[PDB]
Amino acid sequence: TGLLDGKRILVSGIITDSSIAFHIARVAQEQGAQLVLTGFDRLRLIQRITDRLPAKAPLLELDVQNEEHLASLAGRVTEAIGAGNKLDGVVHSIGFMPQTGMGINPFFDAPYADVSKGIHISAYSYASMAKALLPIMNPGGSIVGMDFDPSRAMPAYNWMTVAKSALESVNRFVAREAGKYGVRSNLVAAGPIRTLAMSAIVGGALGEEAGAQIQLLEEGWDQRAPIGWNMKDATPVAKTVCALLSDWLPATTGDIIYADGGAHTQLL
Amino acid sequence: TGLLDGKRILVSGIITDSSIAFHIARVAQEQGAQLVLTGFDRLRLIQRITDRLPAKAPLLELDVQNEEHLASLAGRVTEAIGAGNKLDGVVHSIGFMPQTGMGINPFFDAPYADVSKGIHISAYSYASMAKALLPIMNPGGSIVGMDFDPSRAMPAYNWMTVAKSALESVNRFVAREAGKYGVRSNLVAAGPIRTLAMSAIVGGALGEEAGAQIQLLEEGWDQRAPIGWNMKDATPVAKTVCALLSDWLPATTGDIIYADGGAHTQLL
Amino acid sequence: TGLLDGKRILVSGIITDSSIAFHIARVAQEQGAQLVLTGFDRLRLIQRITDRLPAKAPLLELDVQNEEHLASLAGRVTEAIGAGNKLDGVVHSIGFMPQTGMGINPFFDAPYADVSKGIHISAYSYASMAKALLPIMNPGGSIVGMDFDPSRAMPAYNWMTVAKSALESVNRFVAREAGKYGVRSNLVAAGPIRTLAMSAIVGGALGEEAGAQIQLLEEGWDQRAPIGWNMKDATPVAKTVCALLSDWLPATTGDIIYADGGAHTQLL
Amino acid sequence: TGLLDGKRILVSGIITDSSIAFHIARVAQEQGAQLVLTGFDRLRLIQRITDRLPAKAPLLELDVQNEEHLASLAGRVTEAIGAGNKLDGVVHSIGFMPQTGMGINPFFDAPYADVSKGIHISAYSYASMAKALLPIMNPGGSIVGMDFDPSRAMPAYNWMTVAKSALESVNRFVAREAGKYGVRSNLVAAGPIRTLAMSAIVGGALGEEAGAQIQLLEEGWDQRAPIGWNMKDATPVAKTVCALLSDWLPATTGDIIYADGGAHTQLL
Numbered sequence A, B, C, D: 001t002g003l004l005d006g007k008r009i010l011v012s013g014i015i016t017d018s019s020i021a022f023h024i025a026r027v028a029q030e031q032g033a034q035l036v037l038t039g040f041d042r043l044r045l046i047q048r049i050t051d052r053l054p055a056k057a058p059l060l061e062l063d064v065q066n067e068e069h070l071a072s073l074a075g076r077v078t079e080a081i082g083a084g085n086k087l088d089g090v091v092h093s094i095g096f097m098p099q100t101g102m103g104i105n106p107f108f109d110a111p112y113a114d115v116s117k118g119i120h121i122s123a124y125s126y127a128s129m130a131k132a133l134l135p136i137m138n139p140g141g142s143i144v145g146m147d148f149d150p151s152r153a154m155p156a157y158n159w160m161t162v163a164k165s166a167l168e169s170v171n172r173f174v175a176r177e178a179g180k181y182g183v184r185s186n187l188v189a190a191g192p193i194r195t196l197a198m199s200a201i202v203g204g205a206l207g208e209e210a211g212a213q214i215q216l217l218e219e220g221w222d223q224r225a226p227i228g229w230n231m232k233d234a235t236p237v238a239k240t241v242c243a244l245l246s247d248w249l250p251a252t253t254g255d256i257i258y259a260d261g262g263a264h265t266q267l268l
């Protein structure tokens, strides 16, 4: 009955109930998966959100910049799921860029220390999570991360575009390592979804040229998309992630699936 | 229980039991679809093959070069599935190129009449089938065709590479038309599968440089693919097609999903 | 002094003085090339235009659909340039699509016969010209054709987009054949230039949705382009073609150079 | 007579006489440019090499990790070329990755601190140099950096592939900033050239699987390239860079020109 019946999947990146990861985790549990959740920094907060999913799931702390957390992680998950059981799926739904790197702030004024921090959390950590978790994954497993098509430059996204270009390259190497375990690694490139991280791109703060540019970009999606795009509904994205976590894309790895209404296939 | 439970899907392109389309049709019926089949030219032949699928399905004649067949097609399908019912899925699994266009024959010696015939069957017919069938498709439906990545040139494939480049462009326009109906249009770019059409690329005929080049290309797939590639098993491809026909890639259109072991993501 | 000093170059595709090919031919002669021109159908017409170039050049008839013209072509050029001399450069600046294939006319209503005619002139003829001319080209030579980026679908361009996707694939195979002669083959993907062929896309005829879509597309170029885009000035395109015809891009073949203000590198 | 007659161009990245930058600087001076050179760390060393170029040129110290050097740089160049003169060209020919990030060392064992250092020097510094130099560039100027196509993963190149993916994204944003000054920004993606940095990829050290993989990759270039590829001759690459620095690619920005024999256009 359930697409992910009987699979065990770690989902990272839940912060609010608008989190792409929250909707992935929801759809996963509806399709019969058993989850382990990771949260960063505001754990009691995340737990209250995570209490609203259709089923219970252990929650564990994971700051991908923290080397001890990364080192304990597989042993912690193993404790959460039972000795002798492994993970079938891993979702990386995580990103960060300091405010200098994005929004109004000129591109050339972002210090390297801030860019470097963004690339660590947004790109490198895809490899670091795979490293920590591949040893406790089953053949036929699936690792999925979240992308925003960075093939072309665009206003405001600035250094996060750079970090996504890195992530895509990183995903291609993760696939070479994951292959040795019989495990696939892919990214889902989503269209714009109203989340907390999307509210932080300007720094919210108001009436600046970059805010207008951002509204114009985001409206372009629904226009260009042959099937339309609803920024208010993360479900089509969540479903696509679940497609990859299942056994129905068994020959796809090192790759990017576009859950964007087909917008990236159309110029106008 | 079934991924395609309760959907009605037309599959074209069955000629033998190695046909990519045969394995799509098989997997579809295992996942609860109800099929309508199309066959070209050797109908009694196709019928004997189609008798070995797990369930029965009406078979109809469709030469995509035949304008009367294309004109009657929707009315014929409607008769096969019941007045008041529509198609949820369409699979285009069809191609052709005259022998001058491919194999040993020099690229520059292919007459336009032969190239033109190949592009008609291999590319144009994706639009012509969509034209004929979109009026009898349901919102939320899916059209899928079969591609072989033509982004780079390669030995022997010659004008069929050209025809696949056309098909990709054609698919992007089909998506704009299909959108009006709430229907997606996508291609699956497969790795090499041993089928009848694959036996015809040299013209089989033997010990020529192009035959060796073709064997070297085909071995490269399994090497470059992080998860490996088995040319003997069309199932992973069939499954991927079924992924697209389902409701689990709801935001993907005008696009290409690579069922090739990840080979196209790796240089070596 | 002259970039193309002492080279001999065939330029096709001059119809008016706005023709991309006219500006290629002009810039070529300013940089010291010696030209041979080809014209289709309105030869006395073309000759009057060609009389306004900075220097004289023989003009020859070439309908790329005409097999006798293609067969005589190398012998005709050889007569025009002297026994014992060869071509160093070839410019394909040629395209056509019947009115059903483009503009207002729905995509699905274009008959195959018309599409096929467009692909013959717009794509296939790049191979047919190379075939006819490679035997009379010098090592270190250059073949260049003209593209309009067809990676994504767009309004109105319709089947000509398909024909350009084909051309790109064709160019990649032409490069494999041309390599044997020490000759490169490339396309220049230009931004929109006001030419005769651009006036014919709607069929000119007025106030239809597709006309507006076309004006919106064309304005997007200058906005997205970091250095701007002037649709009134073919010179930057002509210069780029001359770059490829010279000895300064000696390691580039099977490829596409974008003379579009950088518009294709920017989403918004 | 000279392609770059009367232009003033800064070239970074000369370390030995095999340096891609050395051959760019040579070809530039043959075509009449006047140069300013930058060197990192071994200045007396670089100076002896730079003494063998056809003409003299001031040399200045530039570690792109050093913020004071970056801050003084424009004022230093201005002193070297004369108050009231500006730069017409900038060449970034610079990269670095610590040994953990590349060669034999497993991909997952590269610490972030080392990756981060590589991305700082190899990618970020393209923006930092543009920042420092755009204020002293002339309209119609050109910034060029050096790439190695990272679209697909490959053995050994590991984190430097990631850094090149970043660089490509960075170049697209640099083009948006450079546009405001009438200046283009592009990368040249070169085929493999025997340089010092190429000797350091394994760490030279011997008979390991990755060494063989690297030799197999490098031989693939000359095979796949329609015009061949000579790893011993940086001139075709140098010429391509000079093409971009000239006025003959005036409409190309945010982009990548492939000086790789056409290898990236061919699968086999």
Ligand SMILES: NC(=O)c1ccc[n+]([C@@H]2O[C@H](COP(=O)([O-])OP(=O)(O)OC[C@H]3O[C@@H](n4cnc5c(N)ncnc54)[C@H](O)[C@@H]3O)[C@@H](O)[C@H]2O)c1
Binding pocket: A012, A013, A014, A015, A016, A018, A019, A020, A021, A039, A040, A062, A063, A064, A065, A092, A093, A094, A095, A096, A121, A146, A147, A148, A189, A190, A191, A192, A193, A194, A195, A196, A197, A198
């Ligand atoms: N919302 C969109 O339009 C959109 C589109 C495409 C891709 N994405 C990507 O989707 C993913 C999820 O973002 P979202 O939009 O759902 O937003 P969000 O704010 O819901 O989620 C971002 C998550 O990153 C986590 N995070 C930040 N730093 C961390 C660290 N050090 N360690 C671990 N977790 C950390 C936060 O805790 C949060 O849970 C990201 O990779 C984002 O770039 C978003």
Ligand SMILES: NC(=O)c1ccc[n+]([C@@H]2O[C@H](COP(=O)([O-])OP(=O)(O)OC[C@H]3O[C@@H](n4cnc5c(N)ncnc54)[C@H](O)[C@@H]3O)[C@@H](O)[C@H]2O)c1
Binding pocket: B012, B013, B014, B015, B016, B018, B019, B020, B021, B039, B040, B062, B063, B064, B065, B092, B093, B094, B095, B096, B121, B146, B147, B148, B189, B190, B191, B192, B193, B194, B195, B196, B197, B198
């Ligand atoms: N086998 C591979 O390695 C491979 C890989 C990628 C894509 N493909 C594509 O997959 C599709 C199916 O080919 P296959 O390899 O399974 O081979 P096949 O020989 O099994 O199938 C080709 C089908 O095309 C049909 N056909 C030809 N001309 C027709 C016409 N006028 N009208 C209708 N049907 C017509 C034939 O009847 C046959 O059923 C094609 O588009 C092919 O290019 C094949």
Ligand SMILES: NC(=O)c1ccc[n+]([C@@H]2O[C@H](COP(=O)([O-])OP(=O)(O)OC[C@H]3O[C@@H](n4cnc5c(N)ncnc54)[C@H](O)[C@@H]3O)[C@@H](O)[C@H]2O)c1
Binding pocket: C012, C013, C014, C015, C016, C018, C019, C020, C021, C039, C040, C062, C063, C064, C065, C092, C093, C094, C095, C096, C121, C146, C147, C148, C189, C190, C191, C192, C193, C194, C195, C196, C197, C198
């Ligand atoms: N103008 C643009 O915005 C633009 C942009 C990118 C690419 N292009 C391409 O540039 C090339 C030149 O077009 P243009 O815009 O300068 O227009 P045009 O109308 O100046 O040139 C088109 C040429 O094609 C020729 N032609 C048509 N059918 C022919 C045949 N049977 N044999 C030989 N010649 C034939 C015409 O005689 C004419 O000289 C084409 O390939 C076009 O698709 C145009």
Ligand SMILES: NC(=O)c1ccc[n+]([C@@H]2O[C@H](COP(=O)([O-])OP(=O)(O)OC[C@H]3O[C@@H](n4cnc5c(N)ncnc54)[C@H](O)[C@@H]3O)[C@@H](O)[C@H]2O)c1
Binding pocket: D012, D013, D014, D015, D016, D018, D019, D020, D021, D039, D040, D062, D063, D064, D065, D092, D093, D094, D095, D096, D121, D146, D147, D148, D189, D190, D191, D192, D193, D194, D195, D196, D197, D198
């Ligand atoms: N050789 C190839 O096959 C090849 C192919 C494509 C691209 N590339 C790229 O070409 C460029 C030049 O490399 P090369 O192969 O000619 O090698 P190289 O070793 O000749 O040049 C690398 C240069 O980087 C400089 N450098 C390193 N760290 C620096 C820093 N902190 N600040 C300033 N300079 C610093 C070194 O001093 C040296 O001059 C690089 O970007 C390289 O990645 C090389």
Ligand SMILES: N#Cc1ccccc1Oc1ccc(Cn2cc(C3CC3)nn2)cc1O
Binding pocket: A093, A094, A095, A096, A097, A102, A148, A154, A155, A156, A157, A160, A191, A192, A193, A197, A198, A201, A214, A217, A218
């Ligand atoms: N997590 C996270 C995150 C961190 C820094 C920047 C953005 C982040 O999440 C995203 C949120 C939204 C989008 C999509 N998007 C970009 C834009 C405008 C160009 C800024 N609008 N929507 C992409 C994202 O990576």
Ligand SMILES: N#Cc1ccccc1Oc1ccc(Cn2cc(C3CC3)nn2)cc1O
Binding pocket: B093, B094, B095, B096, B097, B102, B148, B154, B155, B156, B157, B160, B191, B192, B193, B197, B198, B201, B214, B217, B218
């Ligand atoms: N149907 C069909 C068809 C028609 C003409 C040529 C090939 C056809 O089917 C295919 C069969 C196999 C492949 C994959 N492929 C290409 C090659 C060698 C380069 C020729 N080997 N495997 C691609 C196909 O389009």
Ligand SMILES: N#Cc1ccccc1Oc1ccc(Cn2cc(C3CC3)nn2)cc1O
Binding pocket: C093, C094, C095, C096, C097, C102, C148, C154, C155, C156, C157, C160, C191, C192, C193, C197, C198, C201, C214, C217, C218
């Ligand atoms: N030659 C020729 C030609 C033949 C059919 C269609 C167009 C032709 O020339 C072009 C003329 C202009 C353009 C650029 N373009 C497209 C468009 C709108 C989308 C139709 N506007 N500018 C591209 C071209 O191939």
Ligand SMILES: N#Cc1ccccc1Oc1ccc(Cn2cc(C3CC3)nn2)cc1O
Binding pocket: D093, D094, D095, D096, D097, D102, D148, D154, D155, D156, D157, D160, D191, D192, D193, D197, D198, D201, D214, D217, D218
């Ligand atoms: N500079 C520099 C540099 C720094 C770290 C790594 C390589 C560097 O220069 C390169 C030297 C050679 C190549 C081309 N290449 C890669 C490879 C094998 C896959 C490692 N062989 N040739 C690409 C380069 O970026």
